[PDB]
Amino acid sequence: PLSVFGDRSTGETIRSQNVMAAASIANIVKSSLGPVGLDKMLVDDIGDVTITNDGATILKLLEVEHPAAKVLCEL
Amino acid sequence: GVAFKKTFSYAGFEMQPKKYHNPKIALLNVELELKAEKDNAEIRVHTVEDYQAIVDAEWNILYDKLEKIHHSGAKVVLSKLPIGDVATQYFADRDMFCAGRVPEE
Amino acid sequence: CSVYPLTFDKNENMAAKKKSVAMHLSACSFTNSDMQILTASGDGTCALWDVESGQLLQSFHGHADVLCLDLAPSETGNTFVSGGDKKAMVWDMRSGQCVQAFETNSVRYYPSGDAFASGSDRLYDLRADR
Amino acid sequence: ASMGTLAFDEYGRPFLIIKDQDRKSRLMGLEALKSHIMAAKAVANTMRTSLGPNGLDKMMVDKDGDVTVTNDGATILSMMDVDHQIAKLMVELSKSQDDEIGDGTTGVVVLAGALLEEAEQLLDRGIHPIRIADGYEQAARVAIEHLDKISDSVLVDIKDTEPLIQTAKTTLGSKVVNSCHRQMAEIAVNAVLTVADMERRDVDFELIKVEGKVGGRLEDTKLIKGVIVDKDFSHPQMPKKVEDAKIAILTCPFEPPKPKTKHKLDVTSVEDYKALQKYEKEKFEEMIQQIKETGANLAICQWGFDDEANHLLLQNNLPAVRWVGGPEIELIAIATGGRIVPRFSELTAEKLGFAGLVQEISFGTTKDKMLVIEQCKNSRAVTIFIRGGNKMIIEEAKRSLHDALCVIRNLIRDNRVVYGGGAAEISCALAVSQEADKCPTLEQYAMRAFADALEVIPMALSENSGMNPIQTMTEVRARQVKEMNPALGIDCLHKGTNDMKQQHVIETLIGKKQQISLATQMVRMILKIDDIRKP
Amino acid sequence: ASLSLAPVNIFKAGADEERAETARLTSFIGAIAIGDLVKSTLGPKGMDKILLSSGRDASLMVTNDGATILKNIGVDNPAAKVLVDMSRVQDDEVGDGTTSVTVLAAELLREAESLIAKKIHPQTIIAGWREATKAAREALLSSAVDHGSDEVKFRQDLMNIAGTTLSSKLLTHHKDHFTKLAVEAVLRLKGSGNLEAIHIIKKLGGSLADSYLDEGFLLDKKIGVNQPKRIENAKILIANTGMDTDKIKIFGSRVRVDSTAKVAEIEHAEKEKMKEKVERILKHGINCFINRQLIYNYPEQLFGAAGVMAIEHADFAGVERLALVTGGEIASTFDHPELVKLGSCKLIEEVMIGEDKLIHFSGVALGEACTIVLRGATQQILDEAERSLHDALCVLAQTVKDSRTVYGGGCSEMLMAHAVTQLANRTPGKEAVAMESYAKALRMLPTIIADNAGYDSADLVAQLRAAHSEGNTTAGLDMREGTIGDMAILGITESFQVKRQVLLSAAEAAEVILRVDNIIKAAPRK
Amino acid sequence: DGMITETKGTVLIKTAEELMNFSKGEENLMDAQVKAIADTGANVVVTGGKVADMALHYANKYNIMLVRLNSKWDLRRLCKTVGATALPRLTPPVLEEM
Amino acid sequence: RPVLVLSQNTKRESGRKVQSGNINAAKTIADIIRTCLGPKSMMKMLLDPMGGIVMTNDGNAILREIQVQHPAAKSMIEISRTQDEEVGDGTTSV
Amino acid sequence: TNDGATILKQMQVLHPAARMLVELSKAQDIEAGDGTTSVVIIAGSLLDSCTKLLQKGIHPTIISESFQKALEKGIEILTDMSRPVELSDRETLLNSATTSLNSKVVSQYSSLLSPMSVNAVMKVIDPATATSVDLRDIKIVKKLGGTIDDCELVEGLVLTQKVSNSGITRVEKAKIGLIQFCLSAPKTDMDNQIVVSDYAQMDRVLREERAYILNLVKQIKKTGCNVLLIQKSILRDALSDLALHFLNKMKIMVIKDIEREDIEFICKTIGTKPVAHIDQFTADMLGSAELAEEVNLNGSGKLLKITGCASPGKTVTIVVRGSNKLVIEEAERSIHDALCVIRCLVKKRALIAGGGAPEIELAL
Numbered sequence A: 001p002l003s004v005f006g007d008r009s010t011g012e013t014i015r016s017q018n019v020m021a022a023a024s025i026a027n028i029v030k031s032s033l034g035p036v037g038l039d040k041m042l043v044d045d046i047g048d049v050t051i052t053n054d055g056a057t058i059l060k061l062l063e064v065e066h067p068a069a070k071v072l073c074e075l
Numbered sequence B: 001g002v003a004f005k006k007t008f009s010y011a012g013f014e015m016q017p018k019k020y021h022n023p024k025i026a027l028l029n030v031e032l033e034l035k036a037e038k039d040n041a042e043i044r045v046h047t048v049e050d051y052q053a054i055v056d057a058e059w060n061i062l063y064d065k066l067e068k069i070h071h072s073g074a075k076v077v078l079s080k081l082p083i084g085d086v087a088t089q090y091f092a093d094r095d096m097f098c099a100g101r102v103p104e105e
Numbered sequence C: 001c002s003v004y005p006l007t008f009d010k011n012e013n014m015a016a017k018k019k020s021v022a023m024h025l026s027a028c029s030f031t032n033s034d035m036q037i038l039t040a041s042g043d044g045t046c047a048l049w050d051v052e053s054g055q056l057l058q059s060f061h062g063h064a065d066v067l068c069l070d071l072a073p074s075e076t077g078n079t080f081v082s083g084g085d086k087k088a089m090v091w092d093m094r095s096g097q098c099v100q101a102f103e104t105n106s107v108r109y110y111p112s113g114d115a116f117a118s119g120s121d122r123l124y125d126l127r128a129d130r
Numbered sequence D: 001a002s003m004g005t006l007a008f009d010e011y012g013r014p015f016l017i018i019k020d021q022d023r024k025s026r027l028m029g030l031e032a033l034k035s036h037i038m039a040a041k042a043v044a045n046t047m048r049t050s051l052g053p054n055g056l057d058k059m060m061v062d063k064d065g066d067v068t069v070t071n072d073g074a075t076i077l078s079m080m081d082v083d084h085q086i087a088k089l090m091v092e093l094s095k096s097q098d099d100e101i102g103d104g105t106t107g108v109v110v111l112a113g114a115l116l117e118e119a120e121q122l123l124d125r126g127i128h129p130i131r132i133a134d135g136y137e138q139a140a141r142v143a144i145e146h147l148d149k150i151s152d153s154v155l156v157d158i159k160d161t162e163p164l165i166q167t168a169k170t171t172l173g174s175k176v177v178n179s180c181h182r183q184m185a186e187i188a189v190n191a192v193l194t195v196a197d198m199e200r201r202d203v204d205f206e207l208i209k210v211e212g213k214v215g216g217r218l219e220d221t222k223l224i225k226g227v228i229v230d231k232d233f234s235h236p237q238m239p240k241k242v243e244d245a246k247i248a249i250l251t252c253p254f255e256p257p258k259p260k261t262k263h264k265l266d267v268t269s270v271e272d273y274k275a276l277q278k279y280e281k282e283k284f285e286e287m288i289q290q291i292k293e294t295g296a297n298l299a300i301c302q303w304g305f306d307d308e309a310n311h312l313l314l315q316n317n318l319p320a321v322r323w324v325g326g327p328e329i330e331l332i333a334i335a336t337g338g339r340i341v342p343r344f345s346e347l348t349a350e351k352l353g354f355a356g357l358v359q360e361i362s363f364g365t366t367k368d369k370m371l372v373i374e375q376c377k378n379s380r381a382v383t384i385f386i387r388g389g390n391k392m393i394i395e396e397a398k399r400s401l402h403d404a405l406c407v408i409r410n411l412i413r414d415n416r417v418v419y420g421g422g423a424a425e426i427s428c429a430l431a432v433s434q435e436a437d438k439c440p441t442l443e444q445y446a447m448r449a450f451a452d453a454l455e456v457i458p459m460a461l462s463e464n465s466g467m468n469p470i471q472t473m474t475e476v477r478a479r480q481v482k483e484m485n486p487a488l489g490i491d492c493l494h495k496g497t498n499d500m501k502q503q504h505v506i507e508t509l510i511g512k513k514q515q516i517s518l519a520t521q522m523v524r525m526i527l528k529i530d531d532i533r534k535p
Numbered sequence E: 001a002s003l004s005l006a007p008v009n010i011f012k013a014g015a016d017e018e019r020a021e022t023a024r025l026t027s028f029i030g031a032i033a034i035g036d037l038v039k040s041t042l043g044p045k046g047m048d049k050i051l052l053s054s055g056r057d058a059s060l061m062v063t064n065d066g067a068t069i070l071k072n073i074g075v076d077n078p079a080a081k082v083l084v085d086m087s088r089v090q091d092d093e094v095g096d097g098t099t100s101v102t103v104l105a106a107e108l109l110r111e112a113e114s115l116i117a118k119k120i121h122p123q124t125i126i127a128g129w130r131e132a133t134k135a136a137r138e139a140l141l142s143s144a145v146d147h148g149s150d151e152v153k154f155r156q157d158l159m160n161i162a163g164t165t166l167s168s169k170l171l172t173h174h175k176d177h178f179t180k181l182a183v184e185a186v187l188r189l190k191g192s193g194n195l196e197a198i199h200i201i202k203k204l205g206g207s208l209a210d211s212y213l214d215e216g217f218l219l220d221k222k223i224g225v226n227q228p229k230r231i232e233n234a235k236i237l238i239a240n241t242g243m244d245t246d247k248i249k250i251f252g253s254r255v256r257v258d259s260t261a262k263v264a265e266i267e268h269a270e271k272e273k274m275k276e277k278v279e280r281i282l283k284h285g286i287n288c289f290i291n292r293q294l295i296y297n298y299p300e301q302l303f304g305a306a307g308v309m310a311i312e313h314a315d316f317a318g319v320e321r322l323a324l325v326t327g328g329e330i331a332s333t334f335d336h337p338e339l340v341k342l343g344s345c346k347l348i349e350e351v352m353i354g355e356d357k358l359i360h361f362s363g364v365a366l367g368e369a370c371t372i373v374l375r376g377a378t379q380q381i382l383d384e385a386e387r388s389l390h391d392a393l394c395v396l397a398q399t400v401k402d403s404r405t406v407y408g409g410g411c412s413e414m415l416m417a418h419a420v421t422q423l424a425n426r427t428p429g430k431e432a433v434a435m436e437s438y439a440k441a442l443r444m445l446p447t448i449i450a451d452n453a454g455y456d457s458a459d460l461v462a463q464l465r466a467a468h469s470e471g472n473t474t475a476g477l478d479m480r481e482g483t484i485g486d487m488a489i490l491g492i493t494e495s496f497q498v499k500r501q502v503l504l505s506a507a508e509a510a511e512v513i514l515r516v517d518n519i520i521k522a523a524p525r526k
Numbered sequence F: 001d002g003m004i005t006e007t008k009g010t011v012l013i014k015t016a017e018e019l020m021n022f023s024k025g026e027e028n029l030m031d032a033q034v035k036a037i038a039d040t041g042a043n044v045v046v047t048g049g050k051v052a053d054m055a056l057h058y059a060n061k062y063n064i065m066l067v068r069l070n071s072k073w074d075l076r077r078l079c080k081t082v083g084a085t086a087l088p089r090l091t092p093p094v095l096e097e098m
Numbered sequence G: 001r002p003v004l005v006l007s008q009n010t011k012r013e014s015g016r017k018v019q020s021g022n023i024n025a026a027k028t029i030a031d032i033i034r035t036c037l038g039p040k041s042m043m044k045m046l047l048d049p050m051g052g053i054v055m056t057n058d059g060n061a062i063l064r065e066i067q068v069q070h071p072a073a074k075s076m077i078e079i080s081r082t083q084d085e086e087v088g089d090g091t092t093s094v
Numbered sequence H: 001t002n003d004g005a006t007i008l009k010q011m012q013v014l015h016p017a018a019r020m021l022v023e024l025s026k027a028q029d030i031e032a033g034d035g036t037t038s039v040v041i042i043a044g045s046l047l048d049s050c051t052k053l054l055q056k057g058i059h060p061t062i063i064s065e066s067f068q069k070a071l072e073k074g075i076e077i078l079t080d081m082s083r084p085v086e087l088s089d090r091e092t093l094l095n096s097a098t099t100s101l102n103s104k105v106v107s108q109y110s111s112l113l114s115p116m117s118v119n120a121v122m123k124v125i126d127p128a129t130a131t132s133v134d135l136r137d138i139k140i141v142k143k144l145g146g147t148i149d150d151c152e153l154v155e156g157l158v159l160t161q162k163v164s165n166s167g168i169t170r171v172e173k174a175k176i177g178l179i180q181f182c183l184s185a186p187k188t189d190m191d192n193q194i195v196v197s198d199y200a201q202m203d204r205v206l207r208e209e210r211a212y213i214l215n216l217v218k219q220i221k222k223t224g225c226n227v228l229l230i231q232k233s234i235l236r237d238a239l240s241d242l243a244l245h246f247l248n249k250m251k252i253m254v255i256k257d258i259e260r261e262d263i264e265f266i267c268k269t270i271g272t273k274p275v276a277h278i279d280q281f282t283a284d285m286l287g288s289a290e291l292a293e294e295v296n297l298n299g300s301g302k303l304l305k306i307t308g309c310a311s312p313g314k315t316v317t318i319v320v321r322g323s324n325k326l327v328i329e330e331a332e333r334s335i336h337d338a339l340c341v342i343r344c345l346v347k348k349r350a351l352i353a354g355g356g357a358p359e360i361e362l363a364l
């Protein structure tokens, strides 16, 4: 009936999806917090290697698709 | 009590009365049909008299089973095995009810 | 589908004579008495032949095309069932008529004779037409 | 919202729960109800144009190209190729109404569609669907009680069939056989009354044989107090007409006997061959003489027979017919008052049936011959033989006659009737409205929606008849309220009056009650479904 | 909201529905297309059609019959299927009128389309058509004339009816000869309705005028080897016995001995049994013997030594026709020679027809069975001649059954239309418009008859309407030159049954199709 | 069930009396065997093969509990548990084998 | 409908496996040139991608001529290059 | 082929008008047998004229009626210009046959075929009584090899079946017997088996079968028969090897596998009444003949010819020979055309000039 060319998510589904995206982004960098934290070694699929602990660098290097996760990255 | 769907009545079934006020029910597991006596049975005769005797013997076997059922005083006959048209017409002639292929349950 | 070779490649075992002219085929089936052969074609006609004399006794047309033929062995004249149409048809060749029909490829006549299988791509009792 | 939830975990690892979950769909919550209501509304709106005397037929085509023109709602929905599950539920509802009653299979779908249409706007206002279903059930109980109150009884005696004929006419009015309306009603009433257990018991439809043949005219349809057969005399030279026939019903082929058990007869000498030949000839002669001994003038067999039996039957002035089917054998035995004899040795005179006339019937330039047995003494079986200008009107006449027979059967079961033409629905709507006023506020909306849905039948009747629906229905309802008369309906035929008693529009109470009950239960079932998990 | 025009999809893949206007459009288009196709083959100046089969056989068949034209066409429009079945049922009920009923139904549906375009409810059209059909049927019944009492008048009516039936067909070249042919063939039935008692034999070659009705009967079987080829004052015995390796009907029976001498004895016993069977057959005192089934070599030579013709493999139709023509009884047992009647005929001989040999039964006893030989230049000519002769025979048999006759040439159509117009002029409301459309179609039928001849159809129909309104109830189209004339004087008569059936069937099918307001198709297998 | 020949079974009937008496005699033999088994006091019968309809009917007549075990491992384990012996024929069990 | 948080081609590995893989890669990189240390070392023939041949026993040259995919191996190669640039000796030793 | 009917039949024409022209050719062949090309040419010319007739604005029915009138007038003219003939006038028949054979490939051989065709037609009918000729009485046998000059008119019967006997190929004063039963072990129509329970029964069965076959052969020989024709049999061996040995030992030629359809032709030719049971096999039921021998066609097959019969009843056989199969087919088609022309002369005793004279006269 809407006849909108696209996909629509409404209610608890979209809220749970946004929370899943945010939790996934958090879990990406949750292991690099505090002195007992450990670094991550990123590969740019062309052989480039980046070893870092900074959250901003990790989130900028990664390519993110979900927009609620982009919100946390730009945060 | 018990009630079940009608099970593939043969010819002559519609002439049987469909209501009884004190029936006796004969529960049987018997095939009341004209059929071979056994799967491996074989009849060897060399005279037309014996041929006619064999045919009449098959008919008499079926009719003896039917008469034994009838003389028991039962009015409703239910069988787990198929009941042929001959038996159905025989029971209709006696104002009796028949129903073959009744399920186990 | 099953066509035996031509020369029979034997030494006159009084069985090399086969007729097998095939003037009609999808359901060629020898009868109880070997004197008659029953065959069917895609024209919707069932043809009965006498193997000895070698001419069509009488053709049966009551159907579209007919596919499967099965015969109940009794003089080869009593009955034969055709299930080619979605119409199982039984014919009597003492009169040449469709004695009974069932509007419902691999029809099989039951050995008892009171029913027959109608496998398509059911046990139909002849005593009740159901 | 659709296809389910696709997360692939919050750690990036695969998250597979249901096999082929990427290829499956899912509708969650209120939108599922909206889709189901929309589908039911579409089905009901399709059906509603075939309601009443002015309804129009649907012309169905199956997968093989065969064409069926019909007004029967159950038949239309059965032949309709649907994929939506709610549409299948509507088809099952129509089939249920046909099975239980046999008439009103179109009204149930329209009523259910109207109920769900009202439930849609009730749901939009924030009411739980279970509450709507409960209110619908309460209003349905009220309507059933009101029908029981305003019902009227008719005489089901055979000495005065006028109310039965009127009821059958009301049933047949919407069908194409309204040209022969009175004759069709008369033959249906006579067919039901002739074969029926008089103590208000069941009517066995197995003893009403309905056969249709092309040619002739629709007015040529007649009720035969006997059996029509699609066979003829075996030998072409036997007489085509037998009067005062003494009938012998046999289930044994006129052939030499053979045991069922695997048997071999050994011929070991020329004397054995001569004995076998003499035995066969004497068997044929003996069976023919045994048949002739009972004094029968006609023989009916089931399993056919060969040439010698045919010539002996012809030679002894014994007309015979072969390959008569089992059901036809039973019908002949019932109608003619004769027994079924399994072999010649058991054939006696007392087992012979009687028929006043056995004849062979021609059908023009068609080569087809069909046997008729009639003029029986007290035949308990009847046959309806239908003629027409094409097969399609013949099938439509068959199902219309079935509707009439089912309606007369319903009268046999219960003799209470309610006048149709929308009067019953209007009175039920008025009763539901009056009951809703005393009801607390929360269920008032559901009961009012039920009343509005009930009022769609008069609106559909007015629409099909060209009248303005709302104005005509409002005027009839106001007249019903003003003067105490629950028999005021929609003047579909423009006879000049709204009172259905003078118009003799009569419906079975059982039919209306079944319609309302089935519609309410199906509407509740549809309202309770909130998820769909199609692949 | 429509079933198909909704966001929610309620159908399988390939299933579709057509609503009111679309269903009416498709039904009217199909019906009008069928009517236009079947027409132009109507009336004395109608033309034939070529039916090229697209299958493997690629059968070619030229014809003028409407039912045959409508049968062998791939039809997908459901209303076209309705009209095709109407034509088939009309052909089954009576021999003629297959084209007329289809044309009438098509014209009625075209008028219905116009009325719907004029914003008229189809129920009103149906009611008006029912009233008009009742009035027209009453008028046609009142106009019927019966001549079943006088034999000469009835024979003249049969002549005229056969001529009218054959006028439109390819036999119109020899209409007189073929009319005499068909009338004699039907009258030889002695009142029986058995059209299968008349056998039509199509032999290629020769002219169409060479066709004739054999004064006796012709069979297309063969005589035995040593049996005589010519018999005078024949005594016929028609049988339906085995006479070929005749085995006893006991089926578990078998020969089980311990030596070949006993096998030879049993074989000699079987041969002796067949010889005794042949002796029993011969004890009837017969010259000829026709068996439905085959006759093998041993009984064949027994008959040859007996000097008795043994015609074999005469099928059920063959033995029935022989019994009808010679009076013999089809027997299967021969233990009572005195209880079996024997057929008789003056002479049995073999004749040449083209390049084939046939058995001729001359000087038959009863003769209630006819053989008609058809000679033509092409196979299509032979088939069309057979179809036309079948039409004529069926109409003549129906006239024999019911002797009521009505005038043709559009006289009956114009009379019914005049009655319908008279009824409409006293009827208020749009039912009058529907009745006028009904009468317009009824008048359109002879208008199409006149169009097929290239005449001034409008002027002729106007003259016919004026004459019928004045009181000249027997005026009709005179196709000889193109004027109007007296059908009674000119002798264009035709069966009342045929016209009644045409009218009623056309009205019934038009009513059935008009009631349709929705067409729903399931997904086809293909 | 009633024992059958291991080579091939064929009932050769040459007179009507044999045809009318064969089934009755077979049923009587079944009844005699079942009653002989029951006369030892055995109120429970366990078999490793199929159960015939007539045998089941006659066992029901004499109030005998029937248990069928398809697996022969289960049969051997039951013999160990109860102390019985797996008879190869349908003869009544002796005192030690029951 | 491939809804995702990260890109489709993104691959993530963590835990003891990463440490074990890094250490094994470094060990195997060392094992490549383990035998080219000391006065009794052996030559190695390196087939340059541009068709040349590099025959040597210097650790830095051998490691530079090798292309690797594991990032730890790349780190070890960079370590060898740094050692060569800073002092010019001890690449194999380091 | 030069035959119009054959040419039109062999090529698959698709247009309906061509199909009806083919049917017209077939009908002309059936009724007459010659002029099959001329009738198609006439029909084509008639429709070609109909083109301009329709273009001028003439209704097709008027054209058909006028064509019917023209056909009646033309039939009258052709009947007027013809002359009567007598079947005793051999020169007219020879000229008709030669005219039939001029257009075919067998034209240099017409001096051989035309008298042969006339003799074949005359020998199978009665000129004083017959009103039609049954061409099935003239059997045509095609044998590859040689030249069309070697075509022969055989008065007796020609059989393509080979002699089962070896060493017997020529019998003079033959007594041909036609047999429709089987010379093998007895076998009833009913299913039959022989049950052996003792060792003596084995050789007793063998001896009894030998005695049965010997008795059959002796009964056949007692009648004086020396040439035996055995009808083709199925479901039972027509001629056993032991039966063949016994027949050979008594000097009897045996020819087996005779087709069922040829029984009538054989009986008409050599006057033998078929025998289906050994009980009815008698000398008076045999067919005498002057000579029955098997000849070889110069290493191109073998033919059995029975020439010279006591009762040569209205039957003749024609042997066609040639270098290749195509010329043999055309030669037999041309011979059939000549026979059909003589048949037409028999049916309608009227002769007309040729070479386009009737058509020019008709046009004028």
Ligand SMILES: Nc1ncnc2c1ncn2[C@@H]1O[C@H](COP(=O)(O)OP(=O)(O)O)[C@@H](O)[C@H]1O
Binding pocket: D050, D051, D052, D053, D055, D073, D103, D104, D105, D106, D107, D170, D171, D172, D173, D174, D175, D420, D421, D422, D461, D489, D490, D491, D492, D493, D505, D507
């Ligand atoms: N003569 C009439 N006048 C007014 N209403 C009628 C008349 N006949 C039938 N009806 C109404 O038409 C409705 C539809 O009936 P019908 O179409 O016959 O079967 P169904 O109820 O299955 O649609 C019924 O509810 C009935 O009340």
Ligand SMILES: Nc1ncnc2c1ncn2[C@@H]1O[C@H](COP(=O)(O)OP(=O)(O)O)[C@@H](O)[C@H]1O
Binding pocket: E041, E042, E043, E044, E046, E066, E096, E097, E098, E099, E100, E163, E164, E165, E166, E167, E168, E169, E408, E409, E410, E449, E477, E478, E479, E492, E494
């Ligand atoms: N000689 C004639 N003169 C005038 N009208 C004729 C003549 N012959 C037939 N008709 C008319 O032609 C109509 C159609 O007849 P016909 O084409 O022969 O068969 P069908 O009814 O199958 O079309 C008939 O209604 C008849 O009135």
Ligand SMILES: Nc1ncnc2c1ncn2[C@@H]1O[C@H](COP(=O)(O)OP(=O)(O)O)[C@@H](O)[C@H]1O
Binding pocket: H004, H034, H035, H036, H037, H038, H099, H100, H101, H102, H103, H104, H354, H355, H356
């Ligand atoms: N020698 C000839 N001289 C002139 N015309 C001939 C001669 N032979 C045949 N014709 C003509 O040739 C025509 C064709 O004859 P033919 O080809 O033999 O058979 P068809 O008539 O079937 O074509 C005949 O009409 C005949 O008049």
Ligand SMILES: [Mg+2]
Binding pocket: D103, D104, D171, D174, D403
């Ligand atoms: Mg109704």
Ligand SMILES: [Mg+2]
Binding pocket: E096, E097, E164, E165, E166, E168, E391
């Ligand atoms: Mg006509």
Ligand SMILES: [Mg+2]
Binding pocket: G089, G090
């Ligand atoms: Mg160093």
Ligand SMILES: [Mg+2]
Binding pocket: H034, H035, H099, H100, H103, H337
């Ligand atoms: Mg020529």
